[PDB]
Amino acid sequence: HHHTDPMVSKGEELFTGVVPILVELDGDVNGHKFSVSGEGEGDATYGKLTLKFICTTGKLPVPWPTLVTTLVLCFSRYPDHMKQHDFFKSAMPEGYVQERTIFFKDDGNYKTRAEVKFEGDTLVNRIELKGIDFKEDGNILGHKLEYNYNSHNVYIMADKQKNGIKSNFKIRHNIEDGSVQLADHYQQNTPIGDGPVLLPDNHYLSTQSKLSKDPNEKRDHMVLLEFVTAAGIT
């Protein structure tokens, strides 16, 4: 609403208020093809996202929690004193590409590519996912993960050569037997437009997610409430 930097003002202007979100994912894991659609809203002022996802092809062949990170960082809450480090909003409305490789310890990997941009007043996240080398009897294809999600902190670094950012972080998925399945994430983001963007100093994002179900829904789905907040700069 009021910043002395016009570049910051520009990005913030698009995220004042509640913004509708559409998510589309086309996936293939070990030859099992699936699609996911999601709809909801984001409120960057509070770093809050509310979304409902549906598997449009039938039963999802992988556990829902494994897709949380793949299925919109522009809705993170950046404190006032850190607004100059918000790469995600600075790239809007043209958007950015988000690419990842996710390695599941002692199992397969996911490779993802997404485009995040505005289509009118709607923020769209379009994703392609390819999963290979998964074990038939493993925790993923075997559906042995609990339907929940742990809080975690993720470090963000600038990649000055690509005019983007990079991040590497570990997600721990709880297994029904009390154990854990590690998922090592490697991420890179680059802008789609050719205009300038804000490259940040090192910092982290604190995330918390709550997974639920819609009691009236017969389709395979996931309801997600996510909070993301930036920190690490005093």
Q: What is the domain partition of the chain in residue ranges?
A: 6-231
CA angle 12, 15, 17 (to 5 degrees): 125
| Tokens encoding 23 | 């998510």
Query: Among 61, 64, 42, which Cα is nearest to 53's?
Result: 64
Separation of alpha carbons 87 and 107, rounded Å: 33
**Which residue stretches of 56-182 are H helix?**
87-90
- Taking the C-alpha atoms of residue 154 and residue 23, their distance in angstroms, rounded to an integer, is 22
**Overall size of the chain counted in residues:** 234
Compute the distance between CA of residue 158 and CA of residue 164 in angstroms, rounded to an integer: 6
Tokens of 137: 């009897």
Experimental method: X-ray
Tokens of 36: 């996911």
Task: Report the C-alpha gap between 87 and 201 in whole angstroms.
Answer: 10
Sign of CA dihedral 151, 157, 159, 164: positive
Decide: helix, strand or coil at residue 145. Answer: strand
Strand duo 19-29 + 122-132: pairing: parallel
Q: Which residues contact 199 (CB under 8 A, 6 or more apart)?
A: 87, 158, 160, 163, 164, 165
Geometric angle at alpha carbon 60, from 221 and 112, rounded to 5°: 100
Class of domain 6-231 (CATH, top level): mainly beta
CA distances from 125 to 37, 38, 108, 143, 177 (A): 10, 9, 24, 26, 34
Dihedral (Cα; 212, 34, 68, 21), 10-degree rounding: -80
| Residue 91 contacts residue 192 (beta carbons within 8 Å) | yes
**CB under 8 Å to 72, separation ≥6 — which residues?**
21, 23, 42, 49, 116, 123, 125
Q: Which amino acid is at 56?
A: T
Contacts of 113 (CB under 8 A, 6+ apart): 97, 98, 99, 127, 128
- Strands, E assignment, the chain: 19-29, 32-43, 48-55, 96-104, 109-119, 122-132, 152-159, 164-174, 180-191, 203-212, 221-231
* DSSP-derived 3-state class of residue 82: helix
Q: Are 102 and 115 in contact (CB under 8 A)?
A: no
CA-nearest of 17, 9, 35 to 121 is 17
